[PDB]
Design a protein around this ligand. Structure first.
Ligand SMILES: [Mg+2]
Ligand SMILES: [Zn+2]
Length: 382
């Protein structure tokens, strides 16, 4: 019944099994100075004495893996902070990460899942449930049934554990000593539960975490499920030319120069790309090279462009989509003598698209204008 917990109560150790703490230490101060494992990644190694019980060690660890975001990894090259597990006298551990090698003992009698999960509980950050600031609301300490050299092991924390307790006093906590801990004669109780009918019982028979233990671990280590919000829509492009070039450049060795121009043409009065010739002038051809646009997702795009063509000098206006090979999508030989929104629906392999706007003007036949406006790029079927 209660003799299974005897390797938990060492004489020269803080609260029986807390190593690296001074037996009569301020309990508020040592808790505040507790360090946690970055990322919930606890590195470890087994001493040769601890190898003989490796299955029972991996059993307690299996408890953290299955319910929390704590990962027990074997120590590899470059790791400096880790737990060396050995078999000393009884079960015990340092509370939190110490920095450098730290010891955990899993002695004779410490094979039980309860004691493995208990000692590993100290290792990752947790203290004793019986000494919480509010424990006296839930348990009575029969000071007269405790050994006089052992009484500090029951001193509770003073309130002011900033933003209060958080998880409620849990009687099924694997971090809670059973009724006969530190008993003077072994059977007389040192702790009495105030809640009618309740018995804490020993730790070695507890199968791992209770529901409240899991909450504490997941809260300390920010373990969670709350899914991040969905990503914003891909912003559809729309050029105006009213304050910029938009990135659309010209080919070098050409006869015409497509220039960013403010004027009036066929109803509208604003900024549009204009290529124009006079009867007196010379042959002008120009290739407006549009910037490179990504599709981001496996979807059929759509490109819009308002095209203006006027004058007998307009010989030909060609729009082409280039990806890995240049493909012609539109060829306009007839002069519309108006603005016409050209709508090209296109498919996407997996590479960025740029567009070409070619225009040829021969002043031999008369005057001519080729204007370009409202250049849009939507990643959805036209
Ligand atoms: Mg002790
Ligand atoms: Zn303990």
């Amino acid at each position: 019944e209660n003799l299974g917990d005897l390797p938990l109560y060492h004489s020269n150790l803080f609260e029986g099994d807390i190593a690296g703490v001074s037996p009569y230490a301020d309990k508020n101060a040592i808790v505040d100075h507790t360090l946690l494992w970055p990322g919930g990644i606890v590195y470890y190694e087994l001493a040769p004495a601890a190898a003989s019980i490796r299955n029972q060690i991996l059993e307690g660890m299996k408890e953290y893996h299955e319910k929390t975001c704590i990962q027990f990894k074997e120590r590899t090259a470059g790791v400096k902070d880790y737990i060396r597990i050995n078999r000393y006298d009884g079960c015990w551990s340092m509370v939190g990460r110490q920095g450098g090698m730290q010891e955990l003992s899993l002695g004779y009698g410490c094979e039980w899942k309860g004691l493995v999960v208990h000692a590993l509980g100290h290792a990752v950050g947790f203290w004793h449930e019986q000494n919480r600031a509010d424990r006296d609301d839930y348990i009575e300490v029969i000071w007269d049934n405790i050994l006089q050299s052992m009484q500090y092991n029951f001193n509770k924390m003073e309130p002011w554990e900033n933003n209060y307790l958080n998880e409620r006093f849990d009687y099924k906590s694997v971090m809670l000593y059973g009724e006969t801990a530190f008993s003077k004669d072994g059977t007389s109780p040192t702790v009495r539960p105030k809640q009618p009918g309740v018995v804490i019982g020993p730790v070695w028979k507890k199968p791992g975490f209770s529901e409240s233990d899991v909450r504490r671990v997941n809260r300390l280590y920010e373990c969670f499920g709350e899914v991040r919000p969905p990503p914003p829509k891909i912003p559809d492009f729309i050029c105006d030319f009213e304050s910029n070039d938009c990135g659309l450049e010209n080919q070098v060795g050409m006869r015409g120069e497509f220039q960013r121009k403010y004027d009036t043409l066929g109803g509208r009065t604003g900024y549009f790309m204009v290529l124009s010739v006079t009867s007196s002038g010379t042959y002008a051809d120009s290739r407006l090279i549009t910037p490179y646009f990504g599709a981001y997702g496996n979807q059929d795009v759509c490109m819009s462009v308002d095209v203006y063509m006027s004058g007998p000098a307009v010989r030909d206006v060609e729009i082409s989509r280039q990806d890995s090979n240049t493909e012609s999508i539109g060829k306009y030989t007839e002069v519309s003598n108006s603005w016409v929104t050209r709508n090209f629906n296109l498919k996407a392999g997996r590479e960025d698209m740029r567009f070409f706007i070619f225009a040829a003007l021969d002043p031999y036949y008369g005057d001519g204008v080729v204007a370009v406006d409202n250049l849009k790029f939507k990643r959805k079927p036209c």
